[PDB]
Symmetry: D2
Subunit: 494 residues, 4 copies
């Protein structure tokens, strides 16, 4: 503990790692009734804290070891941290990573002038190749977490926090992979200000520290979740567990959806993007505040990293959206005797139908206080519309949203037209009103989840002898449109 603090105070991290802000999360603080502070380790040059530990380790090596070079086995944040650390020291770095590793992560490593050697289908094979090269070539292995110099480097995070928040500080929430970050933080905190709680946060699918603490030994998880890839570690480090077992107060676990909501919360207060591992701490805070009914506390989260691919953000946003209970999903039957009048100028997210008595799959923005869906449903029913409320129906939201269509047995004369219109309050209903009922609508699809342009496809029953009227009629509507009647995608599936 003393030994670790001395190493923290004499670390070399500031050759390349930077001091990061400890920022208030204003809206999250208001919601929770506690002062929430975000430690912005995402603002390190490699977009995670790992530059601290990797650099501190590399910098402590002998002139001889540095001459031979360093090696690691990693496809991720450690790889980048070590690569930059090596470049800063002017030494050669070899990073071994699985052949399956995505090309964008490979290039990120090579961008710092490290050699990325592609070997193995998974981490264990990569690791074994690296360890072989240690003996063959005399490279010094640099472990992602299980190394005293690494731990001490990560501990500089706590050194900063305690300097930045010298007053009240109830608890620090730390994501836990192999335990380097939390061990370094716990060492420093429990030495200087032991009244502060050090709380680990792990995914349900990767709770190696929580399980180890419960079992009192270093259990090996049967597998780890892929979502929180920053903390995909099956077994707690040895050097890290030796600190954690006594100096971490507890580990809270959180789910994928909790992580997704935390990513959005952080974005809403800071405009910064965290990777799943980087949002664990805020997710832990939210779960802790509810479990303890905490009020008036000062709670710190380590925003540990931001290395999440753009394509993952779509899914993150989809999952965080579910929490918000804005989107009502309702199935509306239209008698053969408006509807849009009752729904008004509300934001439509889904408006899907296919002739089989007429049923429409409707998604519509609502608000729990300002525009509750229950009143709208009752309103529509009282107007004589059969309505099913599918807002809590998982199949509806996950699947049926994408399944209204199919072939219709007895639609002849179906022609298919795609249209585009500028999005505006009432635009869809205005489109349908201008489209009119000169021909029967036998199919409709329309989705709007933050879309710029309104995009709709409609099937119309147009008798052969009225088809000459199509150009004129549709042009009169005033929107760009395309005749998709001969589109093979339409023919095969619809």
């Amino acid at each position: 503990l003393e030994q670790y603090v001395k190493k923290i105070l004499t670390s070399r991290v500031y050759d390349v790692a930077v001091e990061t802000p400890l920022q208030p999360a204003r809206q999250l603080s208001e919601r929770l009734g506690n002062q929430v502070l975000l430690k912005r380790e995402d603002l390190q040059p490699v977009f995670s804290f790992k530059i601290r530990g990797a650099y501190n380790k590399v910098a402590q090596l002998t002139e001889e070891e540095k001459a031979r070079g360093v090696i690691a086995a990693s496809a991720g944040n450690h790889a980048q941290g070590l690569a930059l650390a090596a470049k800063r020291q002017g030494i050669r770095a070899v990073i071994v990573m699985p052949k399956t590793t995505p090309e964008i992560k490979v290039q990120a490593v090579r961008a710092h002038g490290a050699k990325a050697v592609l070997h193995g289908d998974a981490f264990p094979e990569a690791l074994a190749h690296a360890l072989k090269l240690v003996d063959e070539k005399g490279y010094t292995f640099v472990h992602p977490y299980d190394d005293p110099d690494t731990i001490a480097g990560q501990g500089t995070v706590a050194m900063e926090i305690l300097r930045q928040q010298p007053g009240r500080l109830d608890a620090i929430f730390v994501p836990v992979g192999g335990g380097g970050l939390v061990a370094g933080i716990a060492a420093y905190v429990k030495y200087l200000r032991p009244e502060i709680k050090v709380i680990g946060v792990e995914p349900d699918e990767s709770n190696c520290l929580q399980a180890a603490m419960a079992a009192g030994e270093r259990v090996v998880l049967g597998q780890v979740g892929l979502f929180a890839d920053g903390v995909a570690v099956a077994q707690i480090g040895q050097h890290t567990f030796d600190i954690c077992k006594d100096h971490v107060d507890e580990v809270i676990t959180v789910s994928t959806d909790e992580i997704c909501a935390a990513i959005k919360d952080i974005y809403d207060d800071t405009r910064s993007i965290t990777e799943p591992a980087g949002a664990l701490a805020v997710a832990g805070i939210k779960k802790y505040v509810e479990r303890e009914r905490a009020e008036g506390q000062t709670l710190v989260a380590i925003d540990s990293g931001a290395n999440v691919n753009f394509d993952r953000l779509r899914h993150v946003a989809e999952r965080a959206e579910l929490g918000e209970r804005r989107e009502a999903i309702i199935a509306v039957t239209i008698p053969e005797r408006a509807f849009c009048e009752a729904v008004g100028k509300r934001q439509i997210t889904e408006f899907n139908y296919r002739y089989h008595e007429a049923h429409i799959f409707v998604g519509v923005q609502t608000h729990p206080e300002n525009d509750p869906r229950e009143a709208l449903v009752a309103y529509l029913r009282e107007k004589g519309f059969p309505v099913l409320d599918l807002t809590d129906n998982e199949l509806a939201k996950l699947h049926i949203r994408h399944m209204v269509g199919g072939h219709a047995v007895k639609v002849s004369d179906e022609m298919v037209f795609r249209f585009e219109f500028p999005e505006r309050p009432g635009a869809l209903f205005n489109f349908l009103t201008k489209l009119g009922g000169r021909w029967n609508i036998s199919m409709f699809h329309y989705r709007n989840h933050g879309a710029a342009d309104g995009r709709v496809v409609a099937g119309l029953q147009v008798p052969e002898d009225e088809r000459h009227l199509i150009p004129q009629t549709l042009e009169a509507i005033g929107y760009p449109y395309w005749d998709e009647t001969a589109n093979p995608a339409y023919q095969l599936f619809l």
Copy 2:
């Protein structure tokens, strides 16, 4: 020009605005063969440059004008800029915004101690209410762009850039709403280093400066696109146009999709998210580099803001996917046989499948809507299609079929042709290349699949629904068979949403 530069040099912006980095965009620079630099105005305390101009305007007001307070009409960046500016000066601020305005933006304004007045269904009504309150209450209106003190404040952006990049600098690309930002930048640049090009960038749907410059007067656009909401301005400012008409070299317009791709490019190099208006400049750079076949130039983009709702990233990502055309979409015909759907899934191999959708139509044949990630070099679409065809699968390539990607993706399903033995089951499994095929392997072939929906767009947990033809006298086997798979599952046969639509 001189007048504006003197105002820029004596501005008060640094009471609350900060100096922002001018950052290399490394991967974009390598791709383009030009040094691209990003001016990070997203790192202002209100996540856009507008704190500069709003503060400088407020700070130049007389004690008299300050007395009752300041007012604006804005649902976005200007609202926040002005609210913080007013808090810093210790003055009252009222911000008028439409009733429809999202709660998150309302609260952001109130958080700085400003009064948020909710009035109107659209901006023009909010604006009129604000302007009325000017006369009623004696508040001083603070314009988002059309004010010399605002222009001078925004011009501090150029003052920083020229200090930060004293060497080669070919062109600065600036998003243009009402022209405050670009007018301030143009004033300073054309004064000090006129060899630098000042290039405005506007959306195709909101090109009020480009149209004004072409017409030589301040035309009013018949409407503005709402995608790039930060620059949704129908008419160029008067004070701004007086500068721009002579000192902006040109305006390049870009599409929504180009903006979306620029948002991703910026993210890939910096991890920052720009709002659409904030990505215009990089979109302009990409269009300019191609138009000029530029090489070895130094090109600066103003990343003007980051105030985009998180949920809008879904659409942004969908559009940036289109182009690159990594996602193949194919229609595959198979015979209606117990194991054909599975066998075809096997042929696709260990790839990121994005869509795998089917619904029984006749006994003659079945069609599967398939989405698959591909890579032009590493795993080309064309070779995969040929590979599948050579295995005896009819395949239509629908990758460039807009209807397929926009609509049919969400329309494979519909009602069972006949009454039959369909039971419906939802399942979840860890998402991973090969997980779908592994699921179908574990599910086995006791029962015909009559319906399937599966989408995977960056998902963590794989989700499928399957319709299975389970004869009444085999239904006793269902719990044990499905539990043996080892995944969470739900019997949705009686789900009313299934009954009504499918």
Copy 3:
């Protein structure tokens, strides 16, 4: 004006020059009834502003001009400015300076890797050697002031001041050598905030700008004073005068003594030592405040440099003492009696005695040259003189007698009138008010004091020499008597310096 401002805004000074504080001078402000602010150019790495202009000039040179290197002729601030500038640019620098130049300044130049060439007995010969080497070797000469790029570099001082003090600022006071500093400041100030007065300050002995402005041409002064060595320039620069003639409001001249008092004032408020040139501005402020009876103004002084040899502080302190007139000088007549000298020392009391000197002239009467610290409020000179007279001492007040302070202070002594029994003893004791009288008490009255010298100008250890009339037959008593005093002492009776002069 515009041309110069553009050069200032694009200068390269911040590669090595730093932003300096603009600091309140609290005690000076209270005394003067105006807010005085000190621009701390002494805090540059070379202890003067000249790093700005020298670096900006060097940085604007062509690769060709840089190739063989740069040269200057300077024994002071410019030498150091240029040497550091050249080191920063990675170029060769040669500095020519007179053979007589002090070793400390030579080494300072060499420390930055510049060649110091020692040539000439005075500056003009050094200058000519440098200019010759320009042609011989192809070095580019770097002028201390008369160069547009130098002027623009110095002008960054004004750019900082106007940013640091955006509110009220009545006047900026600038030392003037050849006019680089003031021209750069005037250019920027008269462009941006022309309501601010730009006031040059020169020594009476070196008023080349003041004379040039009065004559409307670049007069050559017949000689320059060497006290304020930083501004020892006979003729205003050409490029500098082109700006100054229209854009400097006036030049105030100050004396050496005024400069010395300003050096102390600055020290008292900041603990910094300015060289004479560096204190001109504050001296100008004091003269201006009195001339205008200014009240409530904000007045800025450029503390331009700190490169004064430590030993010159002796003279500076001596001159700053004169005025204030705290040191009383009096001539006191006493009878020639065993105990009169001591009794008179007693009457002076526990005060800081600065001088207490006497040498026997006749048996009729003795005269003592006395210096004593006084205070106008706390311990007034006039009351002390009256106090001593009222005790029956003839006293002449020589406080305003220049001969007394400059010369007689060092001339009380000379040869014994007759041969006698004079022995001479030097003593040391801890300096403290009353220590002298305590020494004379301990020395006692066995022997007549026939000579005494004692000076105390901030001394730590008190030092006295006394001549004592010790009859041959009492000399055995000397060791024990003097040891009993308890202080170090030395018998100097056989000291050849004593024999020859006294």
Copy 4:
């Protein structure tokens, strides 16, 4: 030790104290053959380090204690440190100081809004009055050094140094008054990097720590020197000695003249002025380098303060000048048969004479290598001038310099004239040549110790019947002059 380090790491000093540069002393390093670094505590807002300890102490007080106010007994750096500390906390401060205290120091305290109560002829009486007010009024006494919170505050100096100089560091040299500064530094250094020597430096006249360490107890010095007023402390603190006795490696003592030379050295490298206490460390370094023949070491000095009155600098410069051996002092006899020709254009500092065979007291700039005085003396003697070399003659330099004059028994017709001329190589000799020998010079005084104007007084033997010629003759010389023949200062003494 651990306890002190925890207090150092959690101190409150940075509310008002600043981080100070650790600056290379380039020319001193070259001379000594060691890397010398100066810790610039003179750049604190009160021009000494004492703001650190005083603030840290005050800030730790209870709300109640702060409400009542703080008191100290000090006329010096502590007074200013405490006054500013109190102002920063918005609390009342009373500083008791002797009635004899100089008015400029009293006003410095009042400038920070502290009440300065004038009581006692010396410190002990001031202290007793303060301690009485503690009981009467409930003020919290703030000790200049002997307080754990004060020690911890001063220790932040070491925290900075070890961060600023993470590589080689052989020894840190610290001025010692009551031992707060050195105790705090020693605590931190011996904890983190015990290989670094911690060396105290005291004046010969105030060596309370050195004596205490030698005696193994807290000896009381019989008196303290006044010159190094910052460290005028007769007895080492209790809390400070408890650290120092084990954790300070040694104390070096230095003299007044050594201190004066160090003040100049620091000025020559930094242009900063240290007070005597503030220059002790550099003086210690110089003495250590010679004693150890140190080479290639890294040696740090605490430049602890700059609160020395302007008037003291004259004396400091006079004493530091003596070290330089530039000024030759010679007594030259002028036969009744040049001289100035032999001396050439050298810088004259003294040129004094009064008729009694003719002897001149001459001060002249020389250089040990470039222009040695021995060669000049031999040169002058070989030209037939009796010369005494008085350069090493203390009476000559301290006293006779100011004593050449007196009455002359048989000078009648003496008239006295003061002149001024611009200083220039050869100016004095040029003046004397132009003054000529129309009348005999019977007296001369001239000193030049960095003077701007040449100032001389001359006695001339002018017969009554030639006095009409005086205005014309002297005006022809071309310098301003004044007839001082009737000046009573001349009459009485000369």
